[PDB]
Design a binder for this molecule. Structure first.
Ligand SMILES: [Mg+2]
Ligand SMILES: [Mg+2]
Ligand SMILES: [Mg+2]
Ligand SMILES: [Mg+2]
Ligand SMILES: [Mg+2]
Ligand SMILES: [Mg+2]
Ligand SMILES: [Mg+2]
Ligand SMILES: [Mg+2]
Ligand SMILES: [Mg+2]
Ligand SMILES: [Mg+2]
Ligand SMILES: [Mg+2]
Ligand SMILES: [Mg+2]
Ligand SMILES: [Mg+2]
Ligand SMILES: [Mg+2]
Ligand SMILES: [Mg+2]
Ligand SMILES: [Mg+2]
Ligand SMILES: [Mg+2]
Ligand SMILES: [Mg+2]
Ligand SMILES: [Mg+2]
Ligand SMILES: [Mg+2]
Ligand SMILES: [Mg+2]
Ligand SMILES: [Mg+2]
Ligand SMILES: [Mg+2]
Ligand SMILES: [Mg+2]
Ligand SMILES: [Mg+2]
Ligand SMILES: [Mg+2]
Ligand SMILES: [Mg+2]
Ligand SMILES: [Mg+2]
Ligand SMILES: [Mg+2]
Ligand SMILES: [Mg+2]
Ligand SMILES: [Mg+2]
Ligand SMILES: [Mg+2]
Ligand SMILES: [Mg+2]
Ligand SMILES: [Mg+2]
Ligand SMILES: [Zn+2]
Lengths: 97, 83, 23, 116, 60, 206, 97, 127, 155
RNA sequence: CCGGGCACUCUAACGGGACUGCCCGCGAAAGCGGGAGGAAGGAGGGGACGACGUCUGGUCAGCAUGGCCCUUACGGCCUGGGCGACACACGUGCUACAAUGCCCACUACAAAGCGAUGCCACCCGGCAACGGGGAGCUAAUCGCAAAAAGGUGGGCCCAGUUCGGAUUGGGGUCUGCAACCCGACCCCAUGAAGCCGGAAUCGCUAGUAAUCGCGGAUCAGCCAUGCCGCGGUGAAUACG
């Protein structure tokens, strides 16, 4: 019964984990509240200028955040409105059982 | 070097030219661009012309020069010393 | 010894293994 | 001249002392002292002529050594140089053999610094 | 030797060793990131515009 | 040369990306290549429109591309006419479900990237550059901005000695992160080479 | 020892040696000329001879410019002389009071 | 029955469990002296309790995670100092003036581009 | 430095004597931030100085410190065209440092093979006014005495 | 580890929090000296951020671009070579010259990252590199994994050595169409210089310097001792 929330934007991660954990807590019944998983970090460190100048860099990062919510007592009055819930663009969702 | 498990490497296209020379009864100069190639026991007694990048170099091949590559005996760098 | 492959200390450095530093 | 042609250091442990033979490192050292059942910890100055001749006998008979080992290395290079391979060339000039950079360094093959 | 080369990188090769990355934007052969298809420079330009999803300037 | 890009500098504080979509390592590059190609035709065809931003959303082989602009009509075509002719060439590159929308600009004179394009065009038309600048700045300030600054560099007026001109009114705190500063750049071709116009607009501190 | 760089130019061992010959003018002052570096370059308006040298009492950094390469090398030397002599005698400047 | 402080230093974290007892001590599933053997830095972890004469009055079970042995020693020093103040709040006087309550924020400072380490610059020769 | 004076760092007392000074001296034994080893050697030394001389490490060490404290030193100041060696009193902070530095240094010039022994010995000899460390102090003190004539040249 | 529980460690989002706010003293004032409270105190440590401008600074070889130049060639494809040359000279670094050390073994404590023809537990073969088997993991689960210095025990005994690991012979493993030029690794043998470095000269003011290992980007492999990060242990000294 697992919903898994992953994105590049942490404000939209808590968005979806609000509006998801709110859905099942209404139409039945047990939600295992939004868990913040550790973030996977991809750094990009690069010479600033186009030519030589090795000692000056600019640091870039890529935060792929992680969230997980569990629907414990399923109660399929939810499993329908979940086939229809409003996803912000910047997030992928994972459900398996 | 190249693993004992895998083959002994010769470019196929040189070996054919060698073997053809064995049958008809050898021997003429064999121009080749195959420095990568192993000298092989059936190559012994030829004189193959190996490329260095500019010249095709005459190498009479002998019994003692058998495991070594083709390029080992056609040098790539001109050097007569300094000053 | 960090430059002596033939020791434990060598192989930690080169980041490798063998008779002298086994896994 | 104990083994084999060389008088290995007394006052030393046999495992170490044997290393003072051309052709015997840590490896071959531990190996002979096993094949002849002697303690490495025994100071050479403490060996039975018995223990000694056991050591001597094995070592001279299983591995090529001293002058004969050198002759071969000479003979190996001797031939490499005469067949005219590229490793032979590097020997023929006293230069490095294993692909090392020679724009700088290379001092062990070259000798210390030569004026211009 | 450039456009011929920005081309020869796209074409599937006579041996797989010859595979090499060019920056998908500018064609640069060196300092090309796998993850973006970008060289170190281009990465900086787009990232500055914000045309790289999630990618921001790190400070710690 | 020293100053950082005021956009990349404010991402996630005063400004938000032109491409919002998650991906994993196998897909990121390939999608982004499309988004490059996408802006290629669109920034090309829509220049005439007065193009200011090309927003891009994504889910799975279907994509929401929000174009912002000063003249929605050039983007529309006749009753949906051109707007479509794009979605066909578009979904031919896209190879997929290409939702192509149009967004208005409340003022091209409060939009940096625009003001820059203008002056670039003014100077490709042999206008007196120093004039162009003070003017463009006066226009942005009349339209209510809390500050403005424009910059031209290159063989100004056709000089050999390249030169750099700029003007400013009000405030333009490039050092301040809570300052909302739209930045825009245009490249002006001429018979004698490339000048570069940089536009700065200070909308207000948040 | 003394090093000469010819930037975007081809110069002969002759010209190289001529530089050694002009630089020796500095040995007059009898102090250690440590790792002297001469750089020769051809700007649009004439050649440039730059040099950077450390001595026990400091560094000589200077540059010559002239339509003639030889003449620039000389002007370089003057600038170097003056600096070197200023190094060697500035210390004497205040033995009283 | 139980007294607790959270103790931290560097990357080291220590959940400390004070209990009354005879004065025997244990860190992460083995005897103290068995886990800190030969580290003269040790007895400083048990130092906060000496400042208030609680050597033998207490047993202690402790987990310790992250950092190294001395940082952990440092954390432990903080945790057992911490817990005393809930066991007994009037205990601040004779713990703060001895710097025991406070947690030093001294953390391995960041390596910077253009340098070899955090601050160590690379060698250069002007001429 | 340029703005305001420097602040001496307060050291943490040593857990075998609680002594601010044994700490400092430990540190001066420490190569490469290997303090544990630095303690071992020191403590080992004490064991030795207990064994070979039946009295207190602490009491001994503290003497060999007082006996290597330089009271005066020369510090250079060019006047005119000569670099004069000026005589100066040494502030106790510096006195300590010099004493500790020298003790270790003198010790590490000794021939006995193990680091623990040398320390033990240098301290023994210095508590009794012998050894390189004390010899450094005297050289330094004679040097300052000789240059007594330039005392009014002091800052 | 299972029931069980989120206390705690943590993880990761939102807040609080320091303000010279209070106290005495000095001061016209801004502030300065100081005490208390407090995790933290006078910018808390670090970071991101670089004014008008200067060097006619750097890059037409990342890219863009005026102009000039080439058009069976100054365009293009390939095989091989070169970029890896070596009387010399300079810059950056690694590893050392040893006992505060070296080797063998037994035994501990990190953090940041990375991982679907990818990381690979475990089993087997081989002294080993590695080979063959083969479970898990779209990864706070599974794996790279061992952190190392450290700790306990044992050897070495001041020797160009049980220091140092360069050079060279021989034998293998792997990637790769292919390792002569020219890869890396393993193992036997070899076992150089080097005994702390003239003139001169670099870094760093605290979790810094020094020392220690671990990751990453690039990448088939790799000449990485380079670079960007991460933690471990952890000083000296600042009159001026
Ligand atoms: Mg560098
Ligand atoms: Mg060794
Ligand atoms: Mg030997
Ligand atoms: Mg070479
Ligand atoms: Mg091109
Ligand atoms: Mg490749
Ligand atoms: Mg590449
Ligand atoms: Mg200059
Ligand atoms: Mg001097
Ligand atoms: Mg944390
Ligand atoms: Mg560190
Ligand atoms: Mg530099
Ligand atoms: Mg001394
Ligand atoms: Mg809670
Ligand atoms: Mg110029
Ligand atoms: Mg170009
Ligand atoms: Mg051009
Ligand atoms: Mg024209
Ligand atoms: Mg090169
Ligand atoms: Mg030199
Ligand atoms: Mg290096
Ligand atoms: Mg990798
Ligand atoms: Mg020797
Ligand atoms: Mg010698
Ligand atoms: Mg040796
Ligand atoms: Mg010695
Ligand atoms: Mg030195
Ligand atoms: Mg040293
Ligand atoms: Mg040196
Ligand atoms: Mg500073
Ligand atoms: Mg070392
Ligand atoms: Mg590494
Ligand atoms: Mg690699
Ligand atoms: Mg090499
Ligand atoms: Zn690029």
């Amino acid at each position: 019964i697992r919903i898994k929330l992953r994105g590049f934007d942490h404000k939209t991660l808590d968005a979806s984990a609000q509006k998801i954990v709110e859905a099942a807590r209404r139409s039945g019944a047990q939600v295992s509240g939004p868990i913040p998983l550790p973030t996977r970090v991809r750094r990009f460190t690069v010479i600033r200028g186009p030519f030589k100048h090795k000692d000056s860099r600019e640091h870039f990062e890529l935060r792929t955040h992680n969230r997980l919510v569990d629907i414990i007592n399923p109660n399929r009055k939810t499993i329908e409105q979940l086939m229809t819930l409003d996803l912000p663009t910047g997030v992928e969702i994972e459900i398996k059982t | 070097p190249r693993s004992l498990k895998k083959g002994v490497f010769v470019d196929d296209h040189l070996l054919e030219k060698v073997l053809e020379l064995n049958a008809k009864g050898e021997k003429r100069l064999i121009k080749t661009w195959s420095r990568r190639s192993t000298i092989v026991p059936e190559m012994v007694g030829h004189t193959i012309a190996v490329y260095n990048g500019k010249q095709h170099v005459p190498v009479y091949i002998t019994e003692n020069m058998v495991g070594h590559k083709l390029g080992e005996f056609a040098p790539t760098r001109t050097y007569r010393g300094h000053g | 010894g960090k430059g002596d492959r033939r020791t434990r200390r060598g192989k930690i450095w080169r980041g490798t293994y063998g008779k002298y530093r086994p896994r | 001249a104990r083994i084999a042609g060389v008088e290995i250091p007394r006052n030393k442990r046999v495992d170490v002392a044997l290393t003072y033979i051309y052709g015997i490192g840590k490896a071959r050292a531990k190996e002979a002292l096993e094949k002849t059942g002697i303690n490495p910890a025994t100071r050479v100055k403490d060996l039975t002529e018995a223990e000694v001749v056991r050591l001597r006998e094995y070592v001279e008979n299983t591995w090529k050594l001293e002058g004969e080992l050198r002759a071969e290395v000479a003979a190996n290079i001797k031939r490499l140089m005469d067949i005219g391979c590229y490793r032979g060339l590097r020997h023929r000039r006293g230069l490095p053999v294993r692909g090392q950079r020679t724009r700088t360094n290379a001092r062990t093959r070259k000798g210390p610094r030569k004026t211009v | 030797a450039r456009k011929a080369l920005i081309e020869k990188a796209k074409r599937t090769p006579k041996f797989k060793v010859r595979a090499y990355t060019r920056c998908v934007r500018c064609g640069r052969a060196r300092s090309v990131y796998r993850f973006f298809g970008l060289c170190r420079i281009c990465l900086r330009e787009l990232a500055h515009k914000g045309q790289l999803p999630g990618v921001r300037k790190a400070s710690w | 040369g020293n100053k950082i890009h005021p956009i990349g500098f404010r991402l996630g504080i005063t400004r938000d990306w032109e491409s919002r979509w998650y991906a994993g390592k196998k897909q990121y590059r390939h999608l982004l290549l499309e988004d490059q190609r996408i802006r290629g035709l669109l920034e090309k065809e829509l220049y005439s429109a007065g193009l200011a931003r090309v927003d891009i959303e994504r889910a799975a082989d279907n994509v929401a591309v929000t174009v912002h602009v000063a003249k929605p009509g050039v983007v529309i075509g006749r009753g949906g006419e051109r707007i479509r002719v794009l979605r066909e060439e578009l979904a031919k590159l896209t190879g997929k479900n290409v939702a192509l929308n149009v967004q208005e600009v409340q003022n091209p004179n409060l939009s940096a990237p625009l003001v820059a394009q203008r002056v670039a065009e003014q100077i490709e038309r042999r206008f007196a550059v120093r004039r162009a600048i003070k003017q463009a700045v006066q226009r942005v300030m009349e339209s209510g901005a809390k500050g403005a600054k424009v910059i031209v560099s290159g063989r100004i007026g056709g000089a050999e000695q390249a030169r750099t001109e700029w003007a400013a009114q009000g405030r333009v705190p490039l050092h301040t992160l809570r300052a909302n500063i739209d930045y825009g750049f245009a490249l002006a071709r001429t018979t004698y080479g490339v000048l570069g116009v940089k536009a700065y607009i200070f909308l207000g501190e948040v | 020892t003394m090093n000469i760089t010819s930037k975007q130019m081809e110069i002969t061992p002759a010209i190289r040696q001529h530089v050694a010959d002009r630089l020796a003018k500095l040995e007059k002052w009898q102090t250690h000329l440590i790792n002297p570096h001469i750089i020769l370059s051809k700007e649009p308006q004439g050649f440039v001879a730059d040099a950077t040298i450390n001595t026990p009492n400091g560094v000589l950094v200077a540059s010559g410019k002239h339509e003639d390469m030889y003449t620039a090398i000389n002007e370089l030397i003057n600038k170097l002389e003056r600096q070197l002599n200023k190094l060697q005698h500035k210390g004497e400047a205040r033995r009283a009071a | 029955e139980q007294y607790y402080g959270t103790g931290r230093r560097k990357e080291a974290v220590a959940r400390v469990f004070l209990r009354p007892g005879n004065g025997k001590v244990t860190v992460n599933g083995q005897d103290f002296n068995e886990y800190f053997q030969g580290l003269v830095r040790a007895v400083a972890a048990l130092e906060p309790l000496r400042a208030v004469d609680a050597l033998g009055h207490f047993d202690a079970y402790i987990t310790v995670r992250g950092g190294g042995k001395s940082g952990q020693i440092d954390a432990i020093k903080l945790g057992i100092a911490r817990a005393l103040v809930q066991y007994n709040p009037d205990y601040r006087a004779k713990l703060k003036p001895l710097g025991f309550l406070t947690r030093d924020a001294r953390v391995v400072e960041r390596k910077k581009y253009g340098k070899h380490k955090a601050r160590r610059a690379p060698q250069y020769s002007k001429r | 430095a340029r703005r305001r004076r420097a602040e001496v760092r307060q050291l943490q007392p040593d857990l075998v004597y609680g002594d601010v000074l044994v700490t400092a001296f430990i540190n001066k034994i420490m190569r490469d931030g290997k303090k544990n080893l630095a303690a071992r050697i020191f403590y080992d030394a004490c064991k030795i100085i207990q064994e070979k001389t039946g009295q207190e490490p602490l009491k001994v060490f503290k003497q060999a410190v007082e006996n290597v404290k330089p009271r005066m030193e020369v510090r250079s100041r060019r006047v005119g065209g000569a670099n004069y060696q000026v005589p100066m009193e040494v502030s106790p902070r510096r006195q300590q440092s010099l004493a500790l530095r020298w003790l270790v240094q003198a010790a590490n010039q000794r021939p006995e093979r193990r680091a623990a022994v040398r320390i033990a010995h240098e301290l023994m000899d210095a508590a009794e006014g012998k050894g390189g460390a004390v010899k450094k102090k005297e050289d330094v003190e004679r040097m300052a005495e000789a240059n007594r004539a330039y005392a009014h040249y002091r800052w």
